[PDB]
Design a protein around this ligand. Structure first.
Ligand code: FE
Ligand code: FE
Ligand code: FE
Lengths: 384, 162, 510, 384, 511
C-alpha cells in the first residue's frame, strides 16, 4: 500500500543518505528574535507573536510595504485608523495567563466535564428540594435568565475587535474574552434547561427572560448600554476597554456577585452560584489581560502613555453614565425580593465593594477621578 | 538608503518634530494625504516611505488634538473643529446622490483623504466607511464584465505603455 | 433523590437563535452589498464548552504524538532535506492564511444577524486560532528538532524578503479580510478552503509521508478534522444571502473574482512546492489541479449551489489554460531569485528531470536546458560568482511582478501565459500578466497599491537587502536561503556581495 | 546512537521479510471471552476483568490449583474465607461509570485544575468579604474541619478491601471509592489552608478541628462509629457496604448536605459549598458503584441472593444504631448556631429527606424494614 | 476586585497530613506481622489525591495520544519482528499480573502503616499499580487489535493457565507479593522485586522492543517507568519505619534473603530466556545484564545504601550467581519441549542466533545447539512429524520436575546449571526440590507451599484434551495458539497434537 519515508527501508535509506552530519543552524529556537516578557521565551509567545503580517507603519510591524489588496475606497486591511489608541509596538501585549488555543480549550473542556459531573450529582442528590420555589420561578427563570442577553450583547461587542485588532496577541486575547462572554450566556441557558429537566412545570423557553430583557424596567438601561457598546462603537479598543474596564466591571460585577451570587444562597439555590463561580473566574481571568493591554502596554506606553490615558479617561467618562444608569435601573430588582431578604445597609455595602474594586482595578490606573460616594449615591437613587 | 530606516524617513521625522499646534499639524497631515496617499496622489516620489511618514504625522496630530480638545470635542469634532456627524452625513448624502461609479469613487477617496483619523473621530469615520463603501461597491460591481477592456481603459484614462 | 441528569450542547443550542434581539442599530459595521437573512440556521449545534471539549480531545491526541513517540523516533530529523525546506514555506504561509481567517471570520460574525450563523462563524474563529497555532507549532517543532531550523525559527520576519510572500499575502491575508464580507467569505470558505486549502492539507500530508515527515501529517490531519464545519459555514453564507436581489446582481462576479484571485497564486505555487520541493513524488500537479478545480470544486461543490444562483467562474477555462506550465515558469523565477528566500532550493536532478519529462512532455528542452546551463555556470557553487538572475539579465528576459496578484512572471520566457500589459496612470506604471487582474485594477485602482520587491529594492545591492532584513543564519554570515540542499559549501553574505547584484525596476525601460 | 527496528532500513527489511502475509488470527479483541455487561465489550471491561489470577474455587475464577505461596499457617492469598457474602462469580460487578485508571485520574485532574482556577478567581474577586466571620471561625475551622477526620477514617476503612477483594472489578471499584474519600478529607484541609491564606489570623493547623474530633461532643458517636467501621471489621465486604450504604449514606449525607451545604450559604459562604459539591459528586458516583456491587450482583445473585440479603440486613441492623448515634450526637451542633438560623421544622425536613433517600437507595434494595419515623425520632432526641 | 489571586498547592495540604491519624485502642494493623512500623514515618513525595491525579493524567495523555494517533498511522503494531510479538504476549501479561498483585500488596502495606504520610505513600502506589495493570493490559489490547498475531494477546488471562512458566510467575509476582508478613511482602515487591528486577527489566524491555521494531512497548513502559522513583521511596521508607524496632535485627535479613531468592529463582532463567530466545536482534548477553542488575546495581549500590539500617546483602547471592550462568538456556530447552502448553509461539535458534550464543556462552553449541539441531532434524517444527521434544525427553530418560516451592521446571539429568534434585515423601505426598534454599523454605513452612504442578494436575490426561479444555486454540477452533515456529504457515492443529498421543505423567511417581 502506502510507503512512508520514515519506515520504508529504501526510501528511508535515501533520506538518511541525503541528511547532513549535524543541523545546519545551532539556533533551534523558533521566535528567538521575539522579546520575552518573562525570563525566557514561552511557547505561547513563540507561537503567537508576529503571526499578524503587519508592515512597520503599523507600530511594531516587521513587514514593509502596503497591503496587497485594500477595501473599495482604499481602506487598509488593518490600519492605525481603526482605533484612537496609539502605541510604539502593538505586539507588546501578553496574556498574563499565556494561553494560546491549546491551554485555553483545555481549561474550558475541564470546566465543561466538571459541570456535567456536577449536574448529574446535583440531580441524583435531589439538592433542588432545598431551593425556594419563588426564587427559582421568578428570579432564576426571569431575571437571571434576562442577564443572558446582557452577556450575549457583551460577547458581540467583540466581533469588530476580532476583525480589527492590530496584533496577534491582542486578537487572541480579545477572542478569548468574547468567547468567555458567550460561554457565560450559554451557561445561564444551560442552568435554565437543567431546571426544566429536574423541575416539572419549569419552562426553559427564553421567552420570559427575553421579554424581561427587551421590555422590562429592571434591565432597560442595561440593554441601552449594551446596545451602545455593541453596535454604536466602531473603535475596537474603545469597545474592549469600555466593556471590560467600565461596564462589565461595575454593572456585571454587581449583578453577578453582589446580587445573584449573594442572594441565591439565602434561597437554597446552590445551583446558580455554581455557574456564577465560573462567570467570576472568567471575569477575573480576563481582567488580567485587559489590565495588561490597557494599563501596562497602552496606558504606560513610553511615547503615548499620556495621550492614551486621556483617551481612556474619555471612554470611562462616556460609558460611566450609562453604566450608572444601568445600575440604577437594576436597583429596582430589590423591591421584588421577599421582605427581609436584604436591607439598604447590605445593598449599600455591596455597591461600595463593587465601586471600590473598580477604582482600585481600573479607574486609578488611568488617573480617572471617580467619586465613590457620588457613584454610590447615583445608583442608590434607584433603590428608594 | 534602507527599507526600514533611511534619510527620507529621518527628514520627515525631523519635520514632524517641529509641529507644535494642532492646526499646523492637521494641515500638514491633510496636505500629505493629498500629496502622497492614493492612486490620485500628486506624486509617487514617496511611494516607498509614505505610509510610515503618515503614521508618524497621525501620531503627532493625535497627541496635539487630545491636548487641545475637551472630552466632548475629542469625541465629536474633527481636528479642524468641524462637527464629525455633520461632515459624515453630508458626505453620505453626496454619495447617495452619486450618478455613476466614477463620481462615487472620487467621493469615497476624497473622504478618506480629508477625514481619516486622527482628523475625524474613529467612530464617525468607520461609520462613514461602512455607508460610503456600500454605495461604492454597489456601483462598481454592477455589470462588472460588461465593459470591454479597451473601453474600460479609455474610461480609466490609462496610458498604454505596452 | 432523582435520576442523574445533565444538559447537552444541543439542548442549549435549541434556544441560541432567540439570543439576538431587535434594536435600531443591530446591523453589520462593514460595507456590504448583501443582507444575510436573520433566520439562517447552523448545521452544527455547538456551544463554547462543547467546542472546547471537542478541540481539546484532538489537541491531546496530536501533542501526545508529537511530544512522546515522534520525538523518540527522531521524526523531526529523518525527513528529506528538500521536504524540510518545503515545510518552512508550507507551514508559515498556511499559518498566515489561518491567522487572517481568524479576522475574516470575525468580520463574518459581525455580518451575520442570525445568532446561529454568528455561532458558526465564532466556532470558525476559534478554529482559525487553533490552526494558526498548529502551523506555528509545525515550524517550532522543526526548528527545535529538525536538520535545519533556520527559516523554521524566524520565518515570520524572514518571509518578507522574497516575492512569493507578497502573492501569499494577497490570497491568504488581504483576500480574506479586505473588501465585502461576502466577498471575503467566498475568498476564504467557498473558494479558498473548498477549492484549495482542504485538498492542499490532505495532499501535503501524503507528500510529507512520502518524504519521511510524520510531524506534518500528525498536525495537518488534526487541522483537517475541523474543515467540515467551515465548509458548512461557507455554504450557510451563500444560503443566507441567496434570498436578496443583491445576490443575483453580485454573487457571480464576487465568486469569479475570488476564484481567479486564489487560483492565480495557488496554481503555480502549489505545483512548484509539490514537484520541486520534494524528493519522492506522489502525483503530477496537472492531474491534481484538474481533479481539485475542475472536478471536485468546479463540478461538484459549485454545482451543489446552483439552486442558490451560483455558477461556475467564467475564468475557470482561462485558469485551466494558464495552469499547465505555470508552476515550472514560477520555479524558474523563484530559483533564479533564491537569495531572497528563507528556504534552501535544489535544482532538479537527473531522476527528477526524467520524471518531469515523463509527466510534462517538452519540459526538458526548455526548463531542463535552462537548469543545466545554470548548473554548468555554478549556480550552486558559491565561488562561481553566478546567480541565475544574472542569466535573466544577460538574455533580456525581464521579470515582472503582477500589480494585482503579486506573482512574478517572465513573459518573454514563460511556456505558459506570456501576456504583458503595462499602463501608466498618474505618473506611475503598472504591469499585468492577465486580463482579469488588469480589469480588477481598472475597476478599483485604489485597492491595489502594493509595492513590489523591485520598486522597494530598486537601486539596492542584494547583499544589503539580505543583511537588513535578517536573511542570515545564526553565525551571522551564511544565508538562510541556498541554491542547494547539501550540508556543505553554503553561500555567505560575502559571496552574494561579490556578485554586485543591484535590483532594477523592470518597468523603468518602458 | 541507537538503531530502531521500525525506522532502521536494514533492521526494518529483516523484520518486514519475517512478517506474515496476513494476521495469524482474526479475533483481534482482547477480552472477547469476557461476558459484556452492556451491548459490546468496553475498554474498561477488556483491561480490567480477569486481571486477578483467581483459580476456579473462588467463584468465577478461570485458573486452576492452589496458590503457589500462602500465609504462615496456611491462609490463602485470596479466599472465600475473607467475606461472608457468597456469589457465583466475583467478576460480575461493573462500575456503572466504567472507570479504569485513565478516565479516573482524568476526571480528578480536571477537578483539581478547576479548583485551582476557582480559588484564584475567588481570592481575586474578594468573595471572602461577604462571609460571616463567626461561621468561618467556628463552623468552618472547628466543625467542618473536624469532619475531615470522619472522611479520613472512612478512607482508611478501604485498605483491607484493597488487599482482600476477590476480583479485579471489585478491587478497582473499592480503590476508587477509598481514593475519593481521602480526596475529600484533603479538600477540607485545603479549604482551611486557603482561608489561612486569604484571612489574616485564620489558623490552618489541624489542632483545633482534631481536638473537636477526638474530644468534642458533637462528633463523639461519629468517631466511635468510624473507629469501629475501620478497625473492628475484618470482612472487606462488610466494611465497604457498611461505610457506603449505612454510615456515609445517612450520617455523612446529613452532615455534608443538610448542615453544611444547607447552612454555609446562609452565612455568605460560597466556598465550603464549592468543595461539598465535589464531595456530593463523589458520593453519587460511588453510590452507583456500590449499588451495582451489592444490589445488582451480590443481592440479586441467582443462587445466594437470599443469603446475601440476609447478611446485608444483618450488617445494616448492626451499623444503623451506631450511625443513628452519630446523627443524634451531631444534632447538638444546631444549638451552637446563631438564633434563627434554622428551626425544628427545617431540621426535621432535612432528616426526613436523608432517611427517605437512604430507604429508597439502600434499605429497600435488601428488604430491610426501616421505620422512617422511628429513625427520625431517635435522631431528633438529641436536638438540644 | 480586591485581593491577590491565590490558591493552595499540594505541599501546603500535605504539611498537615501526618495529623490526619488519631489514637484509639484498635488503631493497629489487621495483618500478622513480626515488625512494628513506626508512626511519624515521613514520605519523600508530598502528594495529595488530586495532585497525584493531575500528574498521572498528564502522562496518560501523552502516552495514549502517541498510541492512538502516530503509532497507529505508522503501523507500529504490525511492523514488529514476529519473535518479539510472541515475547510481548508473555512480557505484557506476566508484568500485568505483577502490577495487579502489587495493588493488593500496597493495599496491605497501607493497612500496615501507622503514620499517615507512610499510609499516603502506599496509597499513591496503590493507584500507580492500578495504572500499571491497565497499561500492561493495554499493551496486550493494542497488539491484539493491531498486531500480526492477536492470539495470546487477546486471551492471555485464561490461556496463561495451561503452561508451567505461569505458575512460577504467580509464585514471584502474585503470592510473593501478598502472602506472608507485610514487611516480607514489601521486601518481595519493593526492595527486591521492583528495585532489583522489575525496574531495570522495564528499561531493558524498551531497549529490546525498540531494537525489534516495537514502539508500543517503549511508549507504554517508559510511562510506567516514570512512576518507580516513588515506589523505590516506598520500599526504602518501609525499611526505615521498621529500623528501630528490635524485631528488625531478628528477622529483616532472613526475610530479605528469602525474598531475593524467591525473585531470583524465577527471573534469572525466565528473563534471560525471554530476552535472548525471544528476539531477533540482541541488545546484550543476559549474563552481563544479570551481573550488572543483581550483583552491581542492587546488591551493591541499593543494598549498600540500605546497610545503615542493618540490611545486609543476601546470603543466597553467591548461590544465585553460581546458578545464573546456564539457567535460562536450561529453562528454554524445557519451555520449547513443552511448547503446546504455552500461549505464545516459540522458535528454534537459527544459525546466526546459534553463532551469537556460542560467541557469548562458550560451550553453548555442543550442548544446547546440538539438542536443538537434533530436534529440528526430528521435525519439531513440522506438524506431520509427530514429534514433540517432550518425547525426546522421555526417550532419553530426562525427567522434567517442577520445584515444589518455586514452580520452575528443571531437568537435573540435563542442566548445565544447578543439576540438584531432592525428593522427600511427607505424609503421603512427594515433593521435589531443585535448590537447598527452597527446600529449607518448604521444611520450615510446608503449609505455605501446596501448589499442584502441571504434572499432578494433568496426570493421565492426553495433551490435546488439556489444550482443548483450557482454550488453547485460535479462533478457527482447531489451530493451537502455541506453535514451535513463528512462521505464517504449517501451524500445528489440535489434531496433530492428538495424533502425538502425549499423555502427561507425574515424574515423581517413579520414586
Ligand atoms: Fe483553517
Ligand atoms: Fe477552515
Ligand atoms: Fe507497577
Amino acid at each position: 500500500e502506502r510507503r512512508r519515508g520514515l519506515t520504508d527501508p529504501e526510501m528511508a535509506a535515501v533520506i538518511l543518505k541525503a541528511l547532513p552530519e549535524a543541523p545546519l543552524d545551532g539556533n533551534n529556537k523558533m521566535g528567538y528574535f521575539v522579546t520575552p516578557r518573562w525570563k525566557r521565551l514561552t511557547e505561547y509567545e513563540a507561537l503567537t507573536v508576529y503571526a499578524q503580517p503587519n508592515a512597520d507603519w503599523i507600530a511594531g510591524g516587521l513587514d514593509w510595504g502596503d497591503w496587497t489588496q485594500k477595501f473599495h475606497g482604499g481602506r487598509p486591511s488593518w490600519g492605525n485608523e481603526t482605533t484612537e489608541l496609539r502605541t510604539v509596538d502593538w505586539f507588546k501585549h501578553r496574556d498574563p495567563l499565556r494561553r494560546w488555543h491549546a491551554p485555553y480549550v483545555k481549561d474550558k473542556a475541564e470546566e465543561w466535564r466538571y459541570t456535567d459531573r456536577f449536574l448529574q450529582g446535583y440531580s441524583a442528590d435531589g439538592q433542588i428540594r432545598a431551593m425556594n420555589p419563588t426564587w427559582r420561578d421568578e428570579f432564576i427563570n426571569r431575571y437571571w435568565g434576562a442577564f443572558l442577553f446582557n452577556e450575549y450583547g457583551l460577547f458581540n461587542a467583540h466581533s469588530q475587535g476580532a476583525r480589527e485588532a492590530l496584533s496577534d496577541v491582542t486578537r487572541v486575547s480579545l477572542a478569548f474574552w468574547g468567547f468567555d462572554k458567550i460561554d457565560i450566556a450559554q451557561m445561564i441557558q444551560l442552568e435554565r434547561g437543567f431546571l426544566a429537566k429536574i423541575v416539572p412545570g419549569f419552562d426553559e423557553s427564553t421567552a420570559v427572560p427575553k421579554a424581561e430583557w427587551t421590555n422590562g424596567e429592571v434591565y432597560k438601561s442595561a440593554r441601552l448600554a449594551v446596545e451602545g457598546l455593541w453596535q454604536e462603537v466602531f473603535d475596537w479598543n474603545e469597545s474592549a476597554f469600555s466593556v471590560h474596564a467600565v461596564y462589565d466591571a461595575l454593572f456585571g460585577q454587581f449583578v453577578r456577585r453582589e446580587f445573584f451570587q449573594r442572594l441565591a444562597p439565602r434561597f437554597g439555590d446552590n445551583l446558580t452560584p455554581f455557574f456564577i463561580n465560573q462567570a467570576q473566574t472568567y471575569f477575573q481571568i480576563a481582567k488580567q489581560g485587559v489590565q495588561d493591554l490597557y494599563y501596562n502596554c497602552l496606558g504606560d506606553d513610553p511615547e503615548f502613555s499620556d495621550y492614551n490615558r486621556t483617551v481612556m479617561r474619555n471612554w470611562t467618562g462616556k460609558w460611566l453614565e450609562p453604566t450608572i444608569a444601568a445600575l440604577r435601573d437594576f436597583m429596582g430588582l430589590f423591591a421584588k425580593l421577599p421582605a427581609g431578604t436584604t436591607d439598604k445597609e447590605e445593598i449599600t455595602a455591596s455597591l461600595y465593594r463593587v465601586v471600590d474594586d473598580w477604582i482600585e482595578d481600573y479607574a486609578s490606573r488611568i488617573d480617572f477621578k471617580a467619586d465613590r460616594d457620588q457613584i454610590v449615591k447615583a445608583v442608590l437613587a434607584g433603590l428608594k | 538608503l534602507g527599507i526600514h530606516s533611511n534619510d527620507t524617513r529621518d527628514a520627515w521625522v525631523n519635520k514632524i518634530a517641529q509641529l507644535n499646534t494642532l492646526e499646523k499639524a492637521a494641515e500638514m497631515l491633510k496636505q500629505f494625504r493629498m500629496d502622497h496617499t492614493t492612486p490620485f496622489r500628486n506624486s509617487y516620489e514617496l511611494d516607498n516611505d509614505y505610509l510610515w511618514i503618515e503614521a508618524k504625522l497621525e501620531e503627532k496630530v493625535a497627541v496635539l488634538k487630545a491636548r487641545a480638545f475637551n472630552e466632548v470635542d475629542f469625541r465629536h469634532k474633527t481636528a479642524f473643529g468641524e462637527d464629525a456627524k455633520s461632515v459624515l452625513d453630508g458626505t453620505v448624502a453626496k454619495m447617495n446622490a452619486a450618478k455613476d461609479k466614477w463620481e462615487a469613487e472620487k467621493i469615497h477617496i476624497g473622504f478618506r483623504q480629508a477625514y481619516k483619523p486622527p482628523i475625524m473621530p474613529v467612530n464617525y469615520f468607520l461609520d462613514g466607511e461602512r455607508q460610503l463603501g456600500t454605495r461604492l461597491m454597489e456601483l462598481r460591481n454592477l455589470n462588472y464584465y460588461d465593459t470591454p477592456l479597451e473601453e474600460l481603459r479609455k474610461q480609466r484614462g490609462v496610458r498604454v505603455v505596452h | 433523590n432523582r435520576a442523574p441528569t445533565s444538559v447537552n450542547a444541543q439542548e442549549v443550542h435549541r434556544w441560541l437563535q432567540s439570543f439576538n434581539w431587535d434594536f435600531k442599530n443591530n446591523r453589520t459595521k462593514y460595507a456590504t452589498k448583501y443582507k444575510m437573512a436573520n433566520e439562517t440556521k447552523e448545521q452544527f449545534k455547538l456551544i463554547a464548552k462543547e467546542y472546547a471539549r471537542m478541540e481539546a480531545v484532538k489537541d491531546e491526541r496530536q501533542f501526545g504524538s508529537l511530544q512522546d513517540a515522534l520525538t523518540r523516533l527522531n521524526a523531526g530529523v529523518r525527513v528529506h532535506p528538500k521536504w524540510n525546506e518545503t515545510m518552512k514555506v508550507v507551514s508559515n504561509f498556511l499559518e498566515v492564511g489561518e491567522y487572517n481567517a481568524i479576522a475574516a471570520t470575525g468580520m463574518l460574525w459581525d455580518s451575520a444577524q442570525a445568532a446561529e450563523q454568528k455561532n458558526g462563524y465564532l466556532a470558525q474563529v476559534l478554529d482559525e486560532i487553533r490552526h494558526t497555532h498548529q502551523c506555528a507549532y509545525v515550524n517550532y517543532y522543526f526548528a527545535k528538532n529538525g536538520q535545519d531550523p533556520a527559516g523554521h525559527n524566524d520565518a515570520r520576519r524572514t518571509r518578507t524578503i522574497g516575492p512569493l510572500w507578497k502573492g501569499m499575502k494577497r490570497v491568504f491575508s488581504d483576500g480574506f479580510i479586505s473588501g465585502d464580507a461576502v466577498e471575503c467569505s467566498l475568498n476564504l470558505q467557498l473558494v479558498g478552503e473548498a477549492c484549495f486549502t482542504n485538498p492542499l492539507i490532505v495532499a501535503v500530508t501524503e507528500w510529507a509521508a512520502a518524504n519521511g515527515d510524520e510531524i506534518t501529517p500528525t498536525v495537518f490531519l488534526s487541522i483537517e478534522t475541523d474543515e467540515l464545519r467551515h465548509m458548512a459555514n461557507g455554504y450557510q453564507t451563500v444560503v443566507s444571502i441567496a434570498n436578496d436581489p443583491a445576490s443575483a446582481k453580485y454573487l457571480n462576479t464576487d465568486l469569479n473574482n475570488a476564484f481567479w484571485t486564489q487560483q492565480k497564486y495557488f496554481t503555480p505555487v502549489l505545483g512548484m512546492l509539490f514537484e520541486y520541493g520534494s524528493k519522492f513524488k506522489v502525483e503530477p500537479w496537472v492531474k491534481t489541479w484538474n481533479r481539485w478545480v475542475y472536478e471536485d470544486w468546479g463540478g461538484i461543490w459549485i454545482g451543489r449551489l446552483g439552486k442558490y444562483g451560483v455558477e461556475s467562474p467564467r475564468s475557470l477555462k482561462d485558469a485551466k489554460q494558464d495552469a499547465y506550465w505555470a508552476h515550472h515558469d514560477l520555479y524558474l523565477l523563484a530559483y533564479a531569485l533564491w537569495p531572497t528566500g528563507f528556504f534552501r532550493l535544489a535544482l532538479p536532478d537527473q531522476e527528477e528531470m526524467e520524471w518531469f519529462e515523463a509527466n510534462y512532455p517538452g519540459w526538458y528542452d526548455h526548463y531542463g536546458k535552462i537548469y543545466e546551463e545554470w548548473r554548468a555556470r555554478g549556480c550552486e557553487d558559491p565561488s562561481s560568482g553566478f546567480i541565475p538572475l544574472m542569466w535573466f539579465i544577460e538574455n533580456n528576459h525581464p521579470i515582472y511582478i503582477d500589480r494585482v496578484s503579486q506573482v512574478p512572471f517572465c513573459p518573454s520566457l514563460a511556456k505558459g501565459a506570456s501576456t504583458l500589459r503595462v499602463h501608466e496612470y498618474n505618473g506611475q506604471m503598472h504591469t499585468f500578466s492577465d486580463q482579469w487582474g488588469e480589469r480588477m485594477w481598472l475597476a478599483e485602482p485604489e485597492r491595489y497599491e502594493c509595492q513590489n520587491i523591485f520598486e522597494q529594492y530598486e537601486g539596492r545591492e542584494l547583499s544589503e537587502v539580505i543583511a537588513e532584513l535578517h536573511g542570515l543564519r545564526s553565525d551571522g554570515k551564511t544565508l538562510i536561503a541556498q541554491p542547494h540542499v547539501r550540508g556543505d559549501k553554503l553561500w555567505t553574505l560575502d559571496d552574494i556581495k561579490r556578485l554586485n547584484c543591484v535590483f532594477k525596476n523592470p518597468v523603468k525601460a518602458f
